[model samples]
Target: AMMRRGEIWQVDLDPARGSEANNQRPAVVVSNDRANATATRLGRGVITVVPVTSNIAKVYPFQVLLSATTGLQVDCKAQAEQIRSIATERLLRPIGRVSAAELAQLDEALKLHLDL
Candidate 1:
């Protein structure tokens, strides 16, 4: 099963079963009360299952079994704000032109974005 961009669909894995793999992946069986049984192969990707009750969607079930990129993407807009703040402080307060203090503040502000 795959859900993307608010659309959900089930896919068969028989075609890709013969492909080579670095490691053995797990297989899953899905059964719907009203639909036919389905078997899916879990590979290198994310999967999400949402529970529906009373004919209304309520919660989302998510499953991820893949490697992700090292870190979160930086917020360019917030970074620009920090740079602007440093520039403004340097221009408004001549004494604030101290390189060490400016560097410390800039470091603090910038480091906040590195969600390590």
Candidate 2:
């Protein structure tokens, strides 16, 4: 799959333990164009992803709120705190995507998470 930034995918988070978000869930591809493209071209088979949850109960500054308008079926928030690298095959399905504006918000979250 041609994974890119701003897109949401059903990711398998199995084998997780101790505070790590596990099970299959939606995640956003936060990798930059260069990194995504490089990984694809080099066949690295890994992409950095920010886990998302439909739990809109509480949101933080480091987390970005997403809506159905952003191609999601329900309200969700990107969990930058749990960002991690995942294999391409772990992408089970396409959940949806975010518009440029929403992507920008996610970028900000990544920036904060990375201290950039």
Candidate 3:
């Protein structure tokens, strides 16, 4: 499927530059479809995304909780603070999409994390 906003895809964050989330994992495409599509279509190799992790021990207000209904294998937390831009090449495959209500909750997490 074509990459779009609000969709979670398995991604590889290799060479994580300091404290940045490393390893291949699920990440939600936070950028709008226009940006993502245009970026890939134009070979810019860029997309803004928020990372998700199954470790919810420290789940803070800056993260959104997601369940299996969202196409996740286990419950996870969308870490807004882990948000970053990565090359489209790093994306593995589409896993699932967050619902409207979940995205709304994600918006709140973003607002809290970035003061946006």
Q: What is the lDDT of residue 13 in candidate 1?
A: 22
**For each candidate, what is the lDDT?**
0.20, 0.86, 0.88
Per-residue lDDT over 23-52 for candidate 2, one digit per residue giving the tens place of the 0 to 100 score: 999999987778888777877768889998
Q: What tens digits encode model 1's per-residue C-alpha lDDT throughout 1-116?
A: 32221111222222223432112112111123122211123322233211111211321112211111201121111121111101111111111111333224334433453331
TM-score, one value per model: 0.17, 0.88, 0.91
Best TM-score among the predictions, by candidate number: 3
- Please give the lDDT score at residue 102 for candidate 1: 29
Candidate 2 C-alpha error for residue 72, in Å: 2.4
Residue 2 in model 1: shift from native, Å?
52
Q: Where does candidate 1 clash, by residue pair?
A: none
Q: Backbone clash tally for model 2?
A: 0
By TM-score, how accurate is candidate 1?
0.17
Off by over 4 Å in 2: 41-44
Question: Between the candidate structures 2 and 3, which one is better when assessed by TM-score?
Answer: 3
Better of 1 and 2 by lDDT: 2
